[PDB]
Design a protein around this ligand. Structure first.
Ligand SMILES: Cn1cc(Nc2nccc(-c3ccc4c(c3)CN(C3COC3)CC[C@H]4NC(=O)c3cn(C(C)(C)C)nn3)n2)cn1
Length: 265
């Protein structure tokens, strides 16, 4: 049921390369757009991912990039997902031609927050939430992508909290200090994502290295208000960065807060 026949795929354009190698745009059965991850040899814990894929198939939300199936009888294995015509949110934000209105930026936050409230309701962690792991469709809707996949990455530079690819700038102090992941580390990352959206894709802590960032966060330094964020919007993103994880909100509370600011606005 989770298996797609790779003979049903037509490959049409290369999208780029991520942690697991090349991703392509194609058609399924001559008709339906898909994205196809071609998993590079050595990059993924494949047997564990294949077992988890059964669970991921049943995650379905309008603001989550849908997993359609896997092709596992051959190597490389393929992961087939919903196709998002406008690519990753980070690059979308950096395209100044869009001249975004702050109401559009708030709606991007709401899109992500609805997806994360859904994953929270299933006790499912994203584990690498960030604008680079969200995607944008042809209607400008933002959806959350590649949730949970961090668990199957074999590259130590990504897994090690001091590795060159670890998401230091999206991590709370208890992750940096103790590798304590929880719902509340996804919360922290979501606040950084809101900051990315309102900063039109600037790098968080852009004047600092990863090592310096970890030191400053531990000492209580925080990101500060982006020029395009109202005071009420900044209060929501800042609430995600309480030092004490248990003082951070849930995604349900964050969603209610975002909807309130939409009414103000
Ligand atoms: C340009 N573009 C793209 C579309 N559409 C579209 N639609 C659906 C999916 C995709 C897509 C999804 C993921 C990735 C790419 C594409 C390739 N992408 C390149 C740079 O930007 C093109 C790099 C990132 C890659 N990340 C991973 O594979 C990945 C990462 N993780 C971790 C969580 C870090 C473990 N796990 N999997 N792209 C339109 N234009």
């Amino acid at each position: 049921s989770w298996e797609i026949d790779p003979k049903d795929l037509t490959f049409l354009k290369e999208l780029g390369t991520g942690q697991f190698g090349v991703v392509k745009y194609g058609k399924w059965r001559g008709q339906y757009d898909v994205a196809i991850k071609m998993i590079k040899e050595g990059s993924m814990s494949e047997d564990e991912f294949i077992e988890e894929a059964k669970v991921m198939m049943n995650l379905s939300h309008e603001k989550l990039v849908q997993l359609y199936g896997v092709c596992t009888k051959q190597r490389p294995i393929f992961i087939i997902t919903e196709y998002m015509a406008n690519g990753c949110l980070l690059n979308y934000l950096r395209e100044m031609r869009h001249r975004f209105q702050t109401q559009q930026l708030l709606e991007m936050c709401k899109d992500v927050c609805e997806a994360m409230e859904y994953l929270e309701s299933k006790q499912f962690l994203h584990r690498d939430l960030a604008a680079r792991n969200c995607l944008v469709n042809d209607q400008g809707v933002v959806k959350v992508s590649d949730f949970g996949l961090s668990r199957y990455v074999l590259d130590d530079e990504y897994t090690s909290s001091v590795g060159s690819k670890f998401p230091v700038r999206w991590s709370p102090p208890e992750v940096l200090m103790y590798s304590k992941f929880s719902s509340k580390s996804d919360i922290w990352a979501f606040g950084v994502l809101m900051w990315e959206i309102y900063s039109l894709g600037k790098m968080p802590y852009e004047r600092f290295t990863n090592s310096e960032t970890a030191e400053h966060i531990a000492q209580g330094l925080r990101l500060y208000r982006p020029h395009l964020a109202s005071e009420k919007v900044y209060t929501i993103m800042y609430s995600c960065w309480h030092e004490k994880a248990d003082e951070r909100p849930t995604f349900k509370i964050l969603l209610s807060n975002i909807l309130d600011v939409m009414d103000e606005e």
